[PDB]
Amino acid sequence: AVETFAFQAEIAQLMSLIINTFYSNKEIFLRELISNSSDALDKIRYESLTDPSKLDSGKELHINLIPNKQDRTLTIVDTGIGMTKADLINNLGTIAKSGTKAFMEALQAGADISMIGQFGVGFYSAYLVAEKVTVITKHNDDEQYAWESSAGGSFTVRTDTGEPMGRGTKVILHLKEDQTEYLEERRIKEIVKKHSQFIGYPITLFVE
Numbered sequence: 001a002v003e004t005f006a007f008q009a010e011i012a013q014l015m016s017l018i019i020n021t022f023y024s025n026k027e028i029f030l031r032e033l034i035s036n037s038s039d040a041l042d043k044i045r046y047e048s049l050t051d052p053s054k055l056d057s058g059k060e061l062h063i064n065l066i067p068n069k070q071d072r073t074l075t076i077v078d079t080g081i082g083m084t085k086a087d088l089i090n091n092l093g094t095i096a097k098s099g100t101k102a103f104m105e106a107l108q109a110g111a112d113i114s115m116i117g118q119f120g121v122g123f124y125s126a127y128l129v130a131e132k133v134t135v136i137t138k139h140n141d142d143e144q145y146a147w148e149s150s151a152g153g154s155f156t157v158r159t160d161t162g163e164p165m166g167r168g169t170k171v172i173l174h175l176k177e178d179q180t181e182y183l184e185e186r187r188i189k190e191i192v193k194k195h196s197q198f199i200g201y202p203i204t205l206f207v208e
């Protein structure tokens, strides 16, 4: 049921740098995840213009932010296009290669970690605040999958046996013990207002 994969070497190196570099401006992770969700929503909306049946798995196009102080998790849910098994295992990592290599050269040349998004590898900034990331996804052309990594050079993929989601992606950030400020309603609002006022889909913050 569970398959284990090695990350592409350059991605493993980037994740180690993100985990081991002293860097205080950690809030940039939320902008990057919301941006990816917005891109996934644009993709399904676009495909639905030539094939309306693409929305049979759900018409609502939105992003939900769900902090959970008890489990110490921050969940980002979207009803975008989702990802196939091939996306999770190889295809997204393949397209990220040049950006990953360029970003690491930029960091060696004195660039700031906040520039990560300009290199298309913004997702990995989640490892500034998360000890583990679980991703539950469902694409119209494939089954529901659960991807997971605590970094350390590998990730896993399994078919998800949990509640079916219809379509989209759920990113569950298992936060580090000293990063619980990202579970506070006022902190999430401050970040979203500062880094995300040009997203064309409703972002709803779930109150505990």
Ligand SMILES: CN(Cc1ccco1)C(=O)c1cc(-c2n[nH]c(=O)n2-c2ccccc2F)c(O)cc1O
Binding pocket: 033, 035, 036, 037, 038, 039, 040, 041, 043, 078, 080, 081, 082, 083, 087, 088, 092, 123, 135, 147, 168, 169, 171
């Ligand atoms: C969950 N991850 C990290 C990861 C671990 C394994 C594979 O990806 C993400 O980056 C991520 C991906 C999507 C997504 N669904 N469909 C699709 O095309 N994308 C996508 C959109 C913009 C850039 C890249 C993308 F893939 C999303 O909606 C939210 C996300 O936070």
